[PDB]
Structures are given as C-alpha cells and as structure tokens.
Amino acid sequence: QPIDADVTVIGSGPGGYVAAIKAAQLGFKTVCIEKNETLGGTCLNVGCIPSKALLNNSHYYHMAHGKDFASRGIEMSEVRLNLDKMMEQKSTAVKALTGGIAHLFKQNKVVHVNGYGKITGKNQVTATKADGGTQVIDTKNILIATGSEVTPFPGITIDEDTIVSSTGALSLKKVPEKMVVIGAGVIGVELGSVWQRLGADVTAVEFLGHVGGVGIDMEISKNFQRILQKQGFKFKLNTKVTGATKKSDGKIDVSIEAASGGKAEVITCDVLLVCIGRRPFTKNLGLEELGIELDPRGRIPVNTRFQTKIPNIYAIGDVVAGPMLAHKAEDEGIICVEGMAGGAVHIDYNCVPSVIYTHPEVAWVGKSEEQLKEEGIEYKVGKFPFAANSRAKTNADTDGMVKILGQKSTDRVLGAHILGPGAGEMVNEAALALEYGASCEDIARVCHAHPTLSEAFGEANLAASFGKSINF
Amino acid sequence: EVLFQGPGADQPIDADVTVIGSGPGGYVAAIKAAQLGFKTVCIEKNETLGGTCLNVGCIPSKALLNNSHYYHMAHGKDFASRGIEMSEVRLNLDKMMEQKSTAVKALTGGIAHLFKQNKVVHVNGYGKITGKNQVTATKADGGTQVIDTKNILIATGSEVTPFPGITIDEDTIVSSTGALSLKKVPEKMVVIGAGVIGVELGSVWQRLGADVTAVEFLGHVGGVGIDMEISKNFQRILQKQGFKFKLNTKVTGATKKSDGKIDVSIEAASGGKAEVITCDVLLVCIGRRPFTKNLGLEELGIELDPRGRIPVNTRFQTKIPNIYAIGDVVAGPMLAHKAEDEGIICVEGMAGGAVHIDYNCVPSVIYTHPEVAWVGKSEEQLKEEGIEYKVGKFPFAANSRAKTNADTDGMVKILGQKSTDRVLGAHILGPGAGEMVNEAALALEYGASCEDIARVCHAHPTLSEAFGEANLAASFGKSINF
Ligand SMILES: Cc1cc2nc3c(=O)[nH]c(=O)nc-3n(C[C@H](O)[C@H](O)[C@H](O)COP(=O)(O)OP(=O)(O)OC[C@H]3O[C@@H](n4cnc5c(N)ncnc54)[C@H](O)[C@@H]3O)c2cc1C
Ligand SMILES: Cc1cc2nc3c(=O)[nH]c(=O)nc-3n(C[C@H](O)[C@H](O)[C@H](O)COP(=O)(O)OP(=O)(O)OC[C@H]3O[C@@H](n4cnc5c(N)ncnc54)[C@H](O)[C@@H]3O)c2cc1C
Numbered sequence: 002q003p004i005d006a007d008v009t010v011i012g013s014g015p016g017g018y019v020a021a022i023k024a025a026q027l028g029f030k031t032v033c034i035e036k037n038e039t040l041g042g043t044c045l046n047v048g049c050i051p052s053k054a055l056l057n058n059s060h061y062y063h064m065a066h067g068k069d070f071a072s073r074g075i076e077m078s079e080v081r082l083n084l085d086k087m088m089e090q091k092s093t094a095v096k097a098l099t100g101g102i103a104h105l106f107k108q109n110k111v112v113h114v115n116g117y118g119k120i121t122g123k124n125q126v127t128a129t130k131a132d133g134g135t136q137v138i139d140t141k142n143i144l145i146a147t148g149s150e151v152t153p154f155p156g157i158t159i160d161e162d163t164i165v166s167s168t169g170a171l172s173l174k175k176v177p178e179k180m181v182v183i184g185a186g187v188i189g190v191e192l193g194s195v196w197q198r199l200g201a202d203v204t205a206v207e208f209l210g211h212v213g214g215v216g217i218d219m220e221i222s223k224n225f226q227r228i229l230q231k232q233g234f235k236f237k238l239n240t241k242v243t244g245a246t247k248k249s250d251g252k253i254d255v256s257i258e259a260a261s262g263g264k265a266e267v268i269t270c271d272v273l274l275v276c277i278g279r280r281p282f283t284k285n286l287g288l289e290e291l292g293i294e295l296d297p298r299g300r301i302p303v304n305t306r307f308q309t310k311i312p313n314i315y316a317i318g319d320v321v322a323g324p325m326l327a328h329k330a331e332d333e334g335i336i337c338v339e340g341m342a343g344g345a346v347h348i349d350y351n352c353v354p355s356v357i358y359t360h361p362e363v364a365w366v367g368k369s370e371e372q373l374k375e376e377g378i379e380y381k382v383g384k385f386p387f388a389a390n391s392r393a394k395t396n397a398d399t400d401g402m403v404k405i406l407g408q409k410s411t412d413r414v415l416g417a418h419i420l421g422p423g424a425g426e427m428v429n430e431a432a433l434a435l436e437y438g439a440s441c442e443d444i445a446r447v448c449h450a451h452p453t454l455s456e457a458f459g460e461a462n463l464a465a466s467f468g469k470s471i472n473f
Numbered sequence: 474e475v476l477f478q479g480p481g482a483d484q485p486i487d488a489d490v491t492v493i494g495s496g497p498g499g500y501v502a503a504i505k506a507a508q509l510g511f512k513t514v515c516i517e518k519n520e521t522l523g524g525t526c527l528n529v530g531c532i533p534s535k536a537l538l539n540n541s542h543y544y545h546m547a548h549g550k551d552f553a554s555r556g557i558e559m560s561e562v563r564l565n566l567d568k569m570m571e572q573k574s575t576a577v578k579a580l581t582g583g584i585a586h587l588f589k590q591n592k593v594v595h596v597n598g599y600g601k602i603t604g605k606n607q608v609t610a611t612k613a614d615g616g617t618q619v620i621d622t623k624n625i626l627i628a629t630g631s632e633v634t635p636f637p638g639i640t641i642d643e644d645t646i647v648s649s650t651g652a653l654s655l656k657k658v659p660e661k662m663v664v665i666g667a668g669v670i671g672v673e674l675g676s677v678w679q680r681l682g683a684d685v686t687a688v689e690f691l692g693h694v695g696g697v698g699i700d701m702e703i704s705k706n707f708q709r710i711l712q713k714q715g716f717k718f719k720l721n722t723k724v725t726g727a728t729k730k731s732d733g734k735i736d737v738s739i740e741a742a743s744g745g746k747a748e749v750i751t752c753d754v755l756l757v758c759i760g761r762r763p764f765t766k767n768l769g770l771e772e773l774g775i776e777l778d779p780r781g782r783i784p785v786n787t788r789f790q791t792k793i794p795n796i797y798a799i800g801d802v803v804a805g806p807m808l809a810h811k812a813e814d815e816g817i818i819c820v821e822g823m824a825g826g827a828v829h830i831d832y833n834c835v836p837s838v839i840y841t842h843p844e845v846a847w848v849g850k851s852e853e854q855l856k857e858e859g860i861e862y863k864v865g866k867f868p869f870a871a872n873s874r875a876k877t878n879a880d881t882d883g884m885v886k887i888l889g890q891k892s893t894d895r896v897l898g899a900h901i902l903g904p905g906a907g908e909m910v911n912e913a914a915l916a917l918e919y920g921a922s923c924e925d926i927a928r929v930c931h932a933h934p935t936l937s938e939a940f941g942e943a944n945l946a947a948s949f950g951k952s953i954n955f
Contacts (some may be wrong), residue, residue, distance in 0.1 A: 015933065019953055022953055023953065026949075026951055034599075036946075044674040044933070046488065046913075049873075049933060050877055050934065053874070053934055054877045054878075055774075055876050055877075057555075057840055057877065057878050058555040058556065058557070060555075061546070061552060061555060062555075062557050064543075065547065065552065065557055065559065066557075070543060070547065071859060072543075072568075073539075073543060073568070073569055073571060073572050074540065074544075074564060074566060074567070074569030074570075074571070075540070075541040075543055075544050075547050075548075075561050075562065075563035075564070075565075075569075076562070076563045076564070076565050076566030076568075077547070077559040077560065077563075078560050078561055079556070079559065079560040080557065080559050081558045082556060082557070082558075082681055082891055083556035083557075083558050084556060085556070086553075086554075086555070086556030087556030087557075088556075089556070090554055090556065090879065094800075094876055094877045096881070097876060098873060098876055098877075101871070102955070105953075105954065123571065124862070145898075208761040231761055242585050320668060321490065326932075326933070327933040327934075328931060328932055329930065331929075331953075332930050335953075348930070349930075352930055353930045354930065354931075354932045356932045356935070364932070380847050382816070389583065391531075391532060391580060392535065394576050394579060394580055395532055395535045395536045395576045396535075396536075396539050397575075397576065398574060409525070423908055425906065425910050425932060425935055426909065426935055426937055427913055427930060428907055428914055428927070428932060428934055429909075429935060429937035429940075430911055430932050431914040432928050432929050432931065432932075433912055433915055433916065433926065434915065434932055436925075436928075436929050436930075437925075439915075439923070443915075443918070444762065446814075446916060446918075447834070447914050447915050448810050448811070448814050448830070448834055448835045448836065448914055448935075449810060449836075449909065449911050449914070450808075450810050450836045450846070450907060450910060450911060451497065451526070451531060451808070451810035451813065451821075451840045452532065452535055452912075453907055453908055453911060454532055454908060455839070455911040458911075467508075469508055469819075470499055471504050472503065472583070472587065473587075
C-alpha cells in the first residue's frame with residue numbers, strides 16, 4: 002500500500018496546488034498532501050480571498066450608507082448592515098474556490114492525500130492522518146510548499162476570541178465598538194478599514210514611522226495614511242506596545258509608549274488584532290533529521306532551481322526567501338516543476354507587484370525612491386494626479402496619483418507606484434513594462450483607451466520621459 | 474487676454490500652427506504643439522472646449538453608465554446578497570443627471586486652464602481655410618479674425634449620421650445627445666443601430682427601468698471588427714439582463730402618433746416580415762460621419778473620399794503639404810484615443826520627428842456591464858487574411874477576484890500565431906475589460922508572445938490573472954485554473 006510518485010508536494014496553498022497541477026500537466030505522476038480540511042492554503046481559507054470579499058462588501062456598505070450613492074441620485078432612507086449575511090457571501094466565495102481546487106486536482110489526475118506530511122527519507126514522505134493512520138509515498142522528488150503562520154507578539158497570547166489574529170478578525174460575529182490593531186502593514190490596514198467602515202472605532206499602532214509595510218514608497222505611504230485618517234481610521238505611528246491585559250469584564254487594556262521611549266499610555270478596546278508579521282512554517286517536517294538547516298529567519302535556503310541541499314528536495318513560496326505573496330508562490334511553483342523537467346527557471350522579484358485593496362487602492366512594482374537613493378541610482382520622477390484623469394473624474398472618484406521613477410541615461414522605467422482607483426489592476430500593465438524593460442517613452446506612446454484610469458499611467462510616464470504631461 | 478480671442482478681438486494673428494477644432498485630437502495637438510515650442514492657435518466654434526467626446530460623447534455616457542450600474546446593484550439583488558439592507562431604493566434622475574453635468578463642466582474648464590498654462594491662443598469662432606497659409610475665424614458677433622499661419626491642422630471631427638425621413642427633434646426622437654439628457658425614464662425605448670453607442674445608451678435606460686429594443690440591419694451587435702464569438706456571447710448576456718434585439722432588421726419608417734407615442738415600421742433586412750413596434754422614445758444612432766462643412770476644402774482643391782473623409786499620408790498631410798488632418802475627419806476607428814494619438818504624432822512630425830502609429834495596437838472598449846474590449850485581430854480577420862492561429866480562452870467564473878466579488882460573466886480570448894506564439898489579438902468580455910485591454914495593447918506594441926505574457930507575475934487576486942491564464946492556454950495548451 003505505499004503510493005509511488007514522481008513528484009510529491011507538501012502543502013496545497015498557491016505555491017503547492019499550482020505546482021501540483023503543473024507537474025501533472027507536464028507528465029509527472031503527482032501527489033499533494035494537505036493537513037487541513039480544504040485545499041488552497043492560507044490564501045484561499047484565511048487570507049486573500051476572505052479579506053478581499055470583506056473589503057468589497059464593506060466598501061459597498063460605505064457607498065450606500067454614506068454620501069456617495071445619494072450624490073448620484075440613488076436614494077434610500079434606511080441602510081442597515083446584516084453582518085451574518087455579509088459573512089455568508091464571504092464564506093460562499095471561499096467554499097466555491099476551495100471546491101474548485103479539488104475539481105482541478107481530479108481533472109489533472111493529481112492524487113490528494115489528506116494528513117500531516119513528514120519527510121521520512123530522501124525519497125519518502127509519510128502522511129499521518131488525524132486518527133493516526135499513515136500513508137507512505139515513495140517518490141523521486143519532494144516539493145516543500147508548507148507556507149507560513151502568524152508571527153506571535155511576545156507576551157500577548159492570541160486566543161481568537163478577544164485577542165485575534167487575521168483569522169479571528171475575518172470572522173468576528175459582530176462589529177466591535179472599539180478595535181486596536183497592532184501592525185500597520187498591508188494586512189493591518191486592510192482589516193482595520195473593513196471594521197472602520199462597518200462602524201468600529203479603529204486605531205492601528207505601529208512601531209515604524211509609516212503604514213503599508215516594507216518597500217512602500219514613503220511619499221505614497223504618507224499620502225495614503227492622510228487619506229485613511231480623513232476616512233476615520235486612526236494611527237499611532239512610532240509607537241511600541243509593551244503589553245496587553247485580558248480583563249475580567251471581557252475588555253482589553255493595551256499599554257503603549259513612544260518607539261524611541263517616553264510617554265506611557267493605556268488604551269482600552271473590545272478586540273485587539275495582532276498582525277505584526279508572518280513567518281515560514283516548517284514544523285515537524287523532518288528537516289533536522291535530514292540535515293536541512295534553516296536560515297536565521299526560519300526560511301529553507303534554496304538554489305536557483307529551488308533545490309535544497311538535498312537536490313531532489315525542493316522548496317517554494319512563503320517557506321523560502323522573497324516577498325510573501327500568493328502570486329510569488331504560484332510562479333515559484335510553476336518554474337520549480339518546469340525545472341524538474343529540464344527547463345530554464347526564472348523569476349524576478351523586482352517585477353513582482355504588491356497591492357493593498359483598500360479604497361483607495363495602493364499598488365506598486367520595481368524600486369521606491371528610497372531604494373533608488375540607497376543604491377545610488379540617478380533617476381527622474383513623473384507624476385500625474387487622478388483628479389486630472391477623465392475616467393476618475395467621470396466616476397467622481399479622484400483621490401491619488403501615479404508616480405513613475407525612470408533612469409536619466411536610458412529612460413528605463415525603474416518603478417511604478419499607484420495610489421487611487423484601479424491601482425490593483427493597473428499595476429499589472431506596469432509589471433509587464435518592467436518585465437520587458439520598457440522606457441517611460443514606450444508607455445507614454447501606448448494608445449491607452451479613452452476614458453480609462455490607465456491614461457494616468459501613460460501620462461505619468463510622459464511626464465518622466467518628456468518633462469510634461471498633456472492634461473496636467 | 475492675448476490668450477482668449479472672442480467676439481470683439483479681431484486683430485490679425487501670426488502662428489506656426491493653427492488647429493481647427495478642440496476635440497481630443499485638436500486640443501491635445503494644440504497643447505503638444507505649444508510644448509514643442511510652436512506659436513499655437515486653436516479655433517473652436519462651440520461655447521466650450523473638448524469636442525464631441527467631452528460634451529456629448531464619452532464623458533456624459535460613461536458617467537450615466539457608472540451611475541446606472543450602481544442603481545442596478547442597489548435596486549436589484551446584488552447589495553442584499555452582501556448583507557447591505559435598504560428600505561425603498563428610489564431613482565432621482567435629476568440628481569443623476571447633475572453628477573454627469575458636473576463632471577463635464579469640470580473637465581471643459583480643465584482644458585481652458587491647460588490652454589492658458591501652455592500659452593495656446595484660443596480663438597472662439599468658425600474657422601475657414603481662406604488660403605494655403607491662412608485661416609479666417611468668423612465670430613458670433615459677425616466679426617472676423619485672420620490668422621496667418623505656416624501649418625494648418627484640421628481636427629473638425631464628426632456629426633451624427635441622419636436617417637432619411639425620420640427627423641431628430643431631441644424631444645421624442647433623439648440622437649445620442651438627446652438620449653444623454655432625457656427628463657424621465659421612458660416606459661419603452663427603441664434604438665436604431667446596435668453599435669457601441671446604441672448598446673451603451675440602451676443599457677443605461679434599461680437599467681433605469683425602460684423596456685428597450687435595438688433594431689440593427691447587420692447580423693451582430695457591437696459595430697465593425699468585434700470578434701463574432703465575443704459579439705454573440707455579449708448579446709446573450711445583454712438579452713438575459715432584459716435588453717431585446719432585432720438583428721437583420723431594417724427600419725422603413727416612423728410616425729409620431731396622437732397619443733404621444735411612436736410607431737416604428739420594420740422588416741427583415743432581405744425583405745418581408747413587415748411589422749410595427751411602438752415606443753415612447755426613439756433613439757437614432759445608425760452612425761457618425763466626418764464633419765468638414767464650410768471649411769474651404771473645395772476652393773483649395775482638397776477632395777474628400779466617398780465617405781467624406783479627408784485623405785492624408787503617413788505624416789497626416791493632405792495633398793497640400795502644410796495642411797494636415799487627424800481624428801474623426803480621417804480614416805480609421807472613430808475613437809478619442811485614436812484622435813489624440815494622431816494629433817500628438819502629427820505635431821511631433823511638424824517639428825521634425827518620426828511619425829508612427831500601428832492601428833493594430835488601437836483598442837476599442839464598450840462600457841457596459843459586463844464590459845467588452847479588444848485589440849489586434851478578430852478570428853474573422855485572421856481567417857480572411859489566411860493567417861494560421863491558435864486560441865486560448867479563460868472564463869471569469871474561474872478567476873478569484875471575479876468570484877470573490879460575485880462578478881463572473883464572460884471570458885478572455887487570445888489569438889496567437891500558430892508557429893511563433895506571437896499575440897495577434899486579445900478579446901475580453903467581462904468585468905474590467907476596459908482597463909485590461911491596455912496591458913494587451915502594450916504587449917502588441919512589442920510584438921510579444923503568449924508565453925511572454927503568461928510569465929508576467931500578475932498580482933493575486935486580480936482580473937488580470939484571467940488575461941495571463943488565456944495566454945498560458947494559448948501558449949502551452951492548458952491554463953492552471955480551468
Ligand atoms: C489575512 C491575509 C491576507 C492576505 N492577502 C493577500 C493578497 O491580497 N495578495 C497576496 O498575494 N497575498 C496575500 N496574503 C499572503 C498569502 O496568503 C501567502 O503569500 C500565500 O498563501 C502563500 O502561499 P504558499 O503556498 O507558500 O503557503 P500557504 O498558503 O501558507 O499554504 C501552506 C499550506 O501547507 C499546509 N501545510 C503546512 N505544513 C504541512 C505538512 N507538514 N503537511 C501537510 N500540509 C502542510 C498548510 O496547512 C497550508 O495549506 C495574505 C495573507 C493573509 C494572512
Ligand atoms: C455618445 C458617444 C459616446 C462615445 N463614447 C466614446 C468612448 O467611450 N471612447 C472613445 O474613444 N470614443 C467615444 N466616442 C467617440 C469620440 O467622441 C470621438 O471619436 C472623438 O470626439 C473624436 O475627436 P476629434 O477631435 O476628431 O473630433 P470631435 O470631438 O468631433 O471634435 C471636433 C471639434 O471641432 C469643432 N469644429 C468643427 N468644425 C469647426 C470649424 N470649421 N471651426 C471651428 N471649430 C470647429 C467642433 O465644434 C468640435 O468641438 C463617443 C461618441 C459619442 C457620440
């Protein structure tokens with residue numbers, strides 16, 4: 002009863018489920034092992050999918066309940082939130098896509114093994130089911146796609162009741178009266194804004210001086226924070242949390258101080274969301290016994306084919322270095338297995354976009370101004386505001402700008418940074434541009450349809466290339 | 474103000490470039506010509522700048538499409554399915570029209586401010602070319618102003634094409650202009666022509682509560698060059714929304730009746746099956762055509778083509794070499810971004826630059842919900858050119874952003890060259906088509922392959938992943954998620 006495979010994938014998130022599918026499409030006898038009830042990993046079950054659903058639903062709530070719909074002649078006397086039903090739309094979307102992956106596995110003849118996978122030899126993986134039953138897979142290659150987990154806050158114990166991670170925050174049973182968020186990174190700002198739109202009094206506390214996490218352009222970050230403050234989202238930047246006490250009355254007392262030191266203070270809230278980071282997950286996988294050592298941050302070191310020290314054991318996604326993003330994991334999955342089959346293996350982390358699905362959105366790809374200064378690159382800047390864009394103006398949705406960074410000597414686009422409507426979709430045109438080594442002039446000369454938000458991308462590139470846009 | 478020459482301002486002007494018309498082609502050409510260091514004049518006959526597009530075209534239409542879509546989401550099922558519960562969703566049409574008007578006004582004022590900032594001299598009057606190097610503007614007060622100029626750029630745009638025997642009065646018989654400003658939602662509307670303008674304006678009124686039928690002489694919706702499979706799928710979706718179609722049908726006449734309603738007589742296009750349909754508002758949108766009235770063309774010897782366009786060469790020169798023409802008044806797709814691009818490169822050409830534009834990289838968009846957008850070649854075009862191609866498709870129903878948003882109609886279709894994998898056409902029916910097609914336009918500019926695009930790290934979850942998936946299916950034979 003051992004299964005014989007060519008490729009055994011441990012984990013079914015964006016890295017592993019896509020790697021399983023592609024490996025099957027390339028002709029490899031393929032197994033995928035998953036410990037959880039459903040397939041899809043962090044992204045589908047407790048990440049990107051439920052968060053974007055709540056961002057969409059909460060945005061439309063705000064449009065209806067606030068001023069926006071009345072200003073377009075859509076009149077309603079009495080707009081009410083039904084939170085159970087909003088959660089149910091979220092849950093339905095999750096269920097359909099997790100079902101979708103099960104179908105795709107059958108369609109592609111990927112064998113799904115349920116259980117906790119442990120590498121029990123160079124060419125062997127053992128999955129242990131919840132009742133203790135085992136299934137052994139003897140296998141040519143092993144692909145580790147075990148992903149990430151929440152980074153705990155030392156001294157504060159998450160219980161998913163009143164002190165929640167992202168997981169708990171995606172499923173609160175009612176709108177909290179007061180919420181504090183620790184970490185103003187991408188996840189914190191998205192979940193904070195959801196709850197703020199729905200009625201919560203929300204403050205994010207962040208040790209650093211800016212919101213939106215690592216690599217966000219500083220000017221874009223400042224402009225983004227100012228807009229969110231005007232919506233009602235409060236921030237205490239440059240601020241340390243010392244501790245948090247669960248109280249007898251169900252509330253929480255949170256002690257903070259300036260990050261440099263000084264001014265202690267206590268803030269009370271009904272829910273504390275702890276989202277200071279995420280970290281690679283390799284627990285009880287069998288690495289120590291194989292001699293595969295981790296790097297100081299818990300990642301598995303790999304070569305450019307994604308091979309560990311043991312050349313038939315591979316790793317991809319949130320368990321390895323680079324941006325902890327679902328598209329990044331997916332592409333590492335694809336190219337790893339293409340490599341197994343003898344092909345070239347390339348991904349360029351500089352061409353991997355980041356998106357924040359707030360309203361307004363934020364999105365960027367390539368280098369920020371700060372990165373270009375660190376590196377000593379000589380660059381120029383083009384900017385165009387959405388207030389001068391015809392589609393944004395027609396939609397009455399005009400916050401933000403596109404900022405382009407270009408190289409003086411060659412006019413090469415080095416980075417694209419977008420704050421405003423449609424940023425998430427627009428950054429894909431920018432990623433193609435960076436992949437192709439576009440000049441700012443090339444982008445300015447594309448015949449962008451009129452009226453589109455994309456025209457602002459064209460115009461900011463014109464400003465960088467020629468010195469001046471047309472419409473501003 | 475030397476920069477505004479209205480009634481009363483009639484001294485002779487000297488210019489390097491005189492642009493006749495302030496639509497997307499003309500106003501942008503003026504701005505760019507000034508930025509290149511030419512002494513530039515733009516002449517406009519109407520009370521506001523920005524032409525057809527700003528005043529009676531793209532801008533007000535897009536505003537009503539956006540607002541009417543939201544009304545649909547609120548008033549039907551969508552908002553309730555997200556737990557957003559509302560008592561009594563009511564249409565305030567005056568207030569919706571007012572949002573539209575506000576946007577138009579801010580953008581027309583925007584162009585006036587840009588002309589100032591760039592030192593473009595705005596002459597308010599009817600321009601007529603009165604010599605190889607001369608334009609005379611006649612103003613509203615009867616006065617005249619001579620511009621002695623080295624180059625002339627004709628950007629006089631287009632007008633609605635009339636329907637013989639049906640008089641547009643902008644009351645119950647409207648053009649696109651009248652349809653953009655109706656006082657009330659008609660109980661029933663007939664639309665003559667199922668081109669882009671017709672389906673957009675139909676759909677607006679359908680959403681707002683009208684019963685709508687479009688009558689079209691050809692066998693498909695969405696105008697010339699739309700891919701036939703995309704057209705059929707789109708038509709089907711619009712039928713399920715409640716928008717009726719009579720294709721392969723000609724209108725033989727219309728009569729305004731004593732009850733205020735209109736009887737529209739129709740037949741099969743080939744003949745027979747005579748029939749009458751009745752409506753409260755009749756929208757006539759069979760086409761648009763180039764506008765060159767009283768421009769001085771005959772006197773100069775500039776002969777028009779049989780469709781009324783001004784023939785020009787690859788630098789946009791007419792047969793008189795210092796007289797140029799761009800935009801809706803020349804050949805090619807009658808589109809704002811097309812006009813604007815011709816304008817820019819024409820004036821770069823006057824300054825000594827290269828003049829290049831690849832029409833196979835010019836997208837078209839329909840701003841319905843779902844949107845339709847495309848660029849490059851359709852299947853029908855590739856067949857008739859004898860090009861060997863392969864197809865990749867990916868449905869929005871398998872895309873995570875579309876699914877999460879419960880916004881899943883349509884697909885992306887990519888056509889790639891059977892041997893080289895070169896992208897030859899991209900055709901998108903669904904949410905976000907208008908924005909997404911610009912990624913495809915950029916790809917086509919480079920001569921990119923299906924593989925090239927499949928390997929771009931599109932962000933997750935985005936609609937654009939469907940674009941990547943369809944390219945992957947075209948390149949490798951199979952996508953990941955379908
Ligand atoms: C709240 C939130 C929102 C997010 N939003 C976005 C977004 O909008 N865009 C974006 O790009 N990214 C987003 N992310 C990040 C994204 O979820 C991750 O980058 C992505 O899931 C990583 O994919 P992966 O395949 O490497 O690992 P994961 O998705 O973490 O999957 C790892 C899988 O392996 C399983 N597993 C682990 N060990 C074993 C074992 N020994 N045996 C069996 N199974 C095992 C796990 O149970 C899990 O299913 C978000 C994350 C969170 C928490
Ligand atoms: C309802 C509607 C919806 C549309 N939607 C879209 C869309 O979504 N996207 C898109 O790309 N296109 C759209 N279009 C088409 C678009 O409006 C045109 O292709 C575009 O305006 C053409 O630009 P132009 O500069 O060539 O001419 P025009 O915009 O027609 O401008 C010509 C200008 O010249 C002026 N003029 C003419 N003759 C003279 C003279 N002798 N002296 C002085 N002034 C003169 C006119 O008054 C006018 O202001 C739409 C059109 C309509 C009617």
